[model samples]
Target chain A: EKIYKVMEEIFVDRHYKENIRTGEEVKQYFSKSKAEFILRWSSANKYVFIAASFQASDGIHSIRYGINKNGELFSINTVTPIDILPLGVMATLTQHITQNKELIEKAL
Target chain B: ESEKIYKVMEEIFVDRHYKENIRTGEEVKQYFAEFILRWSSANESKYVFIAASFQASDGIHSIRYGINKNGELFSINTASNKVTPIDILPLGVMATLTQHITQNKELI
Candidate 1:
């Protein structure tokens, strides 16, 4: 329980929310392909991807993944270069991808 | 029902009491003391202190405290070594405290 609490705190403490447009901030946060993919999907679904950036130079930069009642995925990538791999945000993304694995895999 | 319970929990825990010059620490302590007294009268075998913290844009920090029979106060120090009075409260404290607060609100 203690370990879980620590993990949860560390997980949530750095989590934040932000909005990114096509600018230096977005470029700093997401690769062109990734940003364009997100924006394309978001606009088509009448939603937006809001970014969550970690301030560090080298760590996990992430985004909050949310979808409304409609079947749409919205995301905002983080600006920091920090490897968020250890933070398990990727695992959450994996879970989402797994749910739509066939369609994503087919696209790839 | 869950939202209403959360409302009272927020009221007693997060809502600012003294708008002019609030002594948060004293208010928190008083809230704790009164809650403990009430729990004792109810013959609750176990009791724990619960506090809630809120941060706003204006830099006003508000907190409220309470005691609950099934509250666990070990999570905070065990997880982060920082004494966060709010997170340390046992999980069910909020539910119980909110129920009591709602009952009181109805009376008043």
Candidate 2:
């Protein structure tokens, strides 16, 4: 949803530059584009945590990727960057990503 | 939330509380500081590591702390070899980093 919103805004700007003067034209232009957004759980966690104001009840999350226009990760800082977490919490996060692999891939 | 993050960052870095002396009787002491944040993974909750520095009655001192996606800081009791554990405690909760730690560390 975060990437989609970003894409929608970018499209709005693009359409505005192309002389699509109406608000309806901006919406139509965005609806006509075929863009997809996928995420490494590492990057996806950043959006979720941000929405929660980062006072997340479950400790805190890690962020590791930056996405680009082609639905590919343009930057990957680290796959594992913290060495100070309980095995249980780490396993829980990895397991969640594993379970969501198919759906995550579909967005790619 | 970026405002909150900026506020905390300002508290730690701009205000220099990380180096602010809390000693009642200690003065005329020298301090060396390097409060830059680096995103690091320990094999690496993945966090942006900050080498929060300060001075004490003892000598030049520095310490490593991990700032999670949230504004909160987390660290061990002695990840810092020089900054005396007892001295850091009064630096207050922000720079203390005495949160969610293990390895027999004195943080929660």
Candidate 3:
């Protein structure tokens, strides 16, 4: 929960509310752009990443957030690469570690 | 946790505001979803990423609500899918969330 709360803090402290869109735009994003999400864990780095993308009509689009093992958001300039994620996030990330490196490469 | 939100949504939206108050008949996608960094992600707690989003006026407009575990309010702009804290929120979101709070206190 520590990492989780801090991630929320990051979202709040950084991007709490600056995005506004028309209902039609929202609808388009939800349906066309902001369509899906993913979650992944990096055991080597002791951090986890969550991502959402591919809802774009053109080439590709993705967004991700991370939390270290101790429950902290990763500062952007760390230079360490962070991968992407998927849903059932609470359960999937906890239940398994079978994630291969290749699959994660496509997302992060 | 979502069950709590969903059930309350029904209690409030269905029993209370679900009436045919407004719409554009274009099938306004009354967006209903929550983002959370959870006990997983190697987190110590959970956080609701966005307060919520729903139709505001015509089928073309939508209002996104931002709130965390605490009572902080988020700004109102959707161009970049970012949020920043602000002193106030729109009447529609404030009123709607109040109903949610009436039933669920840990709602942010």
Candidate 4:
């Protein structure tokens, strides 16, 4: 529930729409393999962020965040993907707040 | 363009403490020129990673990395003059091995 709340907060702040999609949404819109993630747009068709998660083990999930540029989506940092979980979600959320403090403060 | 580049570096590097030691616009340009020269001489066609972070008043660290395109060395974004969020891994011998293992795992 905390994970869901944290994700909801991020979705609202970043203007990402979320839904429990069926085969249609998964096949047509979501290009990634699974759909347990968040998506945001910089412009109408320009995706700025795609934070996705996939099951890594029985009870563990591997989450990754990437940026989209010129229609190409790529991981922004290292050459490989970095994985995170629920607790890591809090850390990442804190990071987002710190990095975007100026913008957030301005909006406040 | 030079001002933009320097401003970006200053933000990315958080060069506040080294205000006097910070590179001048011309020096920054020359540094990048030498950097690119060395990179080209190595015949390496891969991009290099540059990461930096700044600690906040609340004791949180905000970080980010700029990727130097194979030939274009000064393409990092710093227009807002702020530290973005990034993940930094441990360094040295063990870190190198860890990297190899993680990459090979293909979980990400």
Candidate 5:
């Protein structure tokens, strides 16, 4: 089976509120422009998440990745604030890259 | 390692907060911040990848992050015009974090 997963770091210029949840809250805390940017970027996925750290207060925001039945890769996302002194946030998308049969057969 | 953090945090939150009662914003922020800090601080030990599986019509957009010999973090982001791998992954990373936590433990 071909499994594809990607990871990296990113920086943004917005400061979030103290304690909040829901995509709506994130949309509110982020400026209209930033929110729009997020929407534009996040339009690719089918799902998203905003995680809380287990060890500490801050967390991560992530978008899951997967291909639809139409063979299109997509994403989904969410957000969380770091100041509330809670655990961190994180997200994942497990994709089966088996669509690329050529690559798998080559491996065999 | 980024994936490890996601899984680790998920375990932590589930153990402490029971996943249901955990706050939202706090989780998101902590995860993203920790991802950045950990990836940046210990650059050489791991690699990061971010894929916008559903953002726009761009398909599976992505980037990569890795530490240099000096342990400096670097990233790339991709676009129609630019396909820098490192710059894009981190941003996608943020999206995934947000999306997953919002899923209410589906990713976990």
Candidate 6:
């Protein structure tokens, strides 16, 4: 209850109504499991992202994703699960790119 | 909500580093644009932090200010600007702080 109140205060104080998303909207766009992943990720990484917000309707029905950097692809509910490739995948891709840096440079 | 507020506080106050990065208006806007993109995507709650970040040729810099759960005045800074947390309890405290800082042209 306290968390919900404070979040509501912040939302109003900041005038972020247009940018916020509800929990159901979250689940609708990304399944319950993926929503959990996003919540945990936002909670853990303050430097990387902001905290997620939730609205209580009987049992907390609405939730919203906080704002962030990166790009439009990284904003709001626009990004899909596939967009955020896993870190391991990114690392492997980075390695592959590094290996072909010479080829990339020549192509450029 | 309390945790989210605390997390926002930490993001603004906890990390203290200084760099010699001169930034222009455009650079600051660019940095914030990116910051918002990431912040919106990651956050899923109602509350949003009033924050900004920047980058220079030398390094990165950011500034954020908000009222905490205790109604304390909390503002963090980089090397260029140093501020002790003030205990002014009032609604719109952030607005006051922002106005004072902007009047002084501190970040400019």
Better of 1 and 6 by TM-score: 6
Cα lDDT tens digits, model 6, A1-108, are 233222322333222222223444555544332221123223222223333333222223222233323221122343322132354222322333234443444555
> Across all candidates, what is each one's fraction of true contacts kept?
0.00, 0.00, 0.07, 0.00, 0.00, 0.00
lDDT of 1 at B67: 31
Count of residue pairs whose backbone atoms collide, per candidate: 7, 6, 24, 1, 87, 28
Interface RMSD of 5: 12.2
The residue-by-residue lDDT of candidate 1 on B50-102, one tens digit each, is: 33333233332322343332332322232343443334234444444444434
Clashing pairs in 2: A80-B44, A81-B41, A81-B42, A81-B44, B41-B44, B100-B108
| Best-first order by TM-score | 6, 2, 3, 1, 5, 4
Across residues A1-58, which tens digit of lDDT does each residue of candidate 5 receive?
A: 0111211111111211223345555545443332211211122222322222111112
Q: Roughly what TM-score does model 2 have, to 2 decimal places?
A: 0.25
lDDT of each: 0.31, 0.32, 0.34, 0.31, 0.27, 0.35
TM-score (chain A only) for the predictions, listed in order: 0.24, 0.20, 0.30, 0.26, 0.21, 0.21
After superposition, the stretches of candidate 1 with alpha carbons farther than 4 Å from their true spots are A1-23, A30-65, A69-90, A94-108, B1-108
Residue pairs that clash (backbone atoms under 3 angstroms), model 4: B63-B86
lDDT of 2 by residue, A1-108 (tens): 133222222222211122333444434544545322112122142321111001122322223333342322232343332221354322433343344443444554
lDDT of 3 by residue, B1-108 (tens): 322321222222322223222233233343222211111111111223332223322223333444454445454355785765544335544354554433332332
Model 6 chain B: worst 10 consecutive residues (lDDT sum): B33-42
Candidate 6 deviant stretches above 4 angstroms: A1-108, B4-26, B29-77, B80-83, B106-108
Residue A46 lDDT (model 4): 27
Cα lDDT for residue B51, model 5?
16
**By the DockQ metric, which is better: model 4 or model 5?**
5
lDDT by residue (tens digit), candidate 4, A1-108: 122223223443322334422334434444544433334321111223444322222322222344333223234443343334355443554444334433444555
| Interface RMSD for each predicted structure | 10.8, 16.8, 12.7, 17.2, 12.2, 12.0
